[PDB]
Amino acid sequence: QESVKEFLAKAKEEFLKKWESPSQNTAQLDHFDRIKTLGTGSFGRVMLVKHKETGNHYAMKILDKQKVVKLKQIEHTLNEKRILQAVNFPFLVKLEFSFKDNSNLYMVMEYVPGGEMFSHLRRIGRFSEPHARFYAAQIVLTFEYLHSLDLIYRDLKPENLLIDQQGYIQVTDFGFAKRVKGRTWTLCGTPEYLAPEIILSKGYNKAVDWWALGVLIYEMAAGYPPFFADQPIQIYEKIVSGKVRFPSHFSSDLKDLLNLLQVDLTKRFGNLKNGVNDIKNHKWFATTDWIAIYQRKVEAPFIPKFKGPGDTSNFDDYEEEEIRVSINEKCGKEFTEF
Numbered sequence: 001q002e003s004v005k006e007f008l009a010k011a012k013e014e015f016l017k018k019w020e021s022p023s024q025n026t027a028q029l030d031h032f033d034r035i036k037t038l039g040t041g042s043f044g045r046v047m048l049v050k051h052k053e054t055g056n057h058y059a060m061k062i063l064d065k066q067k068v069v070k071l072k073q074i075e076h077t078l079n080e081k082r083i084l085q086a087v088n089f090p091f092l093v094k095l096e097f098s099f100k101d102n103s104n105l106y107m108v109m110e111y112v113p114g115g116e117m118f119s120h121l122r123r124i125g126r127f128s129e130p131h132a133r134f135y136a137a138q139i140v141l142t143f144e145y146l147h148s149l150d151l152i153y154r155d156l157k158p159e160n161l162l163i164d165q166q167g168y169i170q171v172t173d174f175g176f177a178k179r180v181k182g183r184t185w186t187l188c189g190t191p192e193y194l195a196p197e198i199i200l201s202k203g204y205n206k207a208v209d210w211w212a213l214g215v216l217i218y219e220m221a222a223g224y225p226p227f228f229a230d231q232p233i234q235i236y237e238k239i240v241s242g243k244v245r246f247p248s249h250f251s252s253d254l255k256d257l258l259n260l261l262q263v264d265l266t267k268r269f270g271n272l273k274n275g276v277n278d279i280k281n282h283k284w285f286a287t288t289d290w291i292a293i294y295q296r297k298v299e300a301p302f303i304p305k306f307k308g309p310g311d312t313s314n315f316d317d318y319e320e321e322e323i324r325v326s327i328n329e330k331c332g333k334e335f336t337e338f
């Protein structure tokens, strides 16, 4: 459709202008009050903060430079910030500011108070097909956008999909996203969502995101992932096997679409001559109005319960640790471009 082709051509022009001249150093730490830890990992965490002059709330991702170096995440961290400052799409969390100091790297993002899709899925058990289809359509459009910019996302899982005040998705965590025109080789991603070609250490491409969409749709509609097992090595054996079992409650159209979980990447939907259109035109999506979804004109199946833009009740509790800043600069060379 020409209107879609023209939209994507403008989207790539605007991305490239920011990609080639990235913003830097657009805030500082003492402009914000720290409120609460929203999540934690091996080299970073995310904290709710409030801007002291405007009163606006944000989610601030804080990375310790020395730990980034030690866990071999330098390039990944530079990818994350350079991509986030350049993209713009209705279903991607927005980067508002970025900066660094002697000790840390900071990405200040919009705060989405409805919490992770993962929490809501585990509460209710499983989503109906219409409810799963509403979220899946947003991921299909987001991947069409990212792939047209030559970006692979590589971290799709329910924990990275936040639910906003209108019940739509905001994708967060660009820590494994990368600009790739051909193949790439890094081992990364959560075990249950890895495509076979990642597990087998091959040069892989954007088809790994369409595989991960198949895992996400199965998990939303079943309540558990298709290759579940107790330990990673057992998960990986099931992934490479070519076999999947579907619950009897799945529709025949859903089973047929889940062409996404095709072990041969050269036969996988999203990676054929018609690209994303094989997914968008599949019978499981026959009731989906793609333009209305993009315009946020569809009524969502679920509106999260929260009291206001500072409420943290849809996130969980972590031990609260200091944000320390050394008097000496650490790892200045490695992070020059941030």
Ligand SMILES: O[C@H]1CN[C@H](c2nc(-c3ccc(F)cc3)no2)C1
Binding pocket: 124, 125, 126, 222, 223, 224
């Ligand atoms: O053998 C026992 C122990 N684990 C099994 C299990 N059942 C599910 C499940 C989750 C959500 C659903 F909607 C449906 C089923 N997850 O684990 C049952």
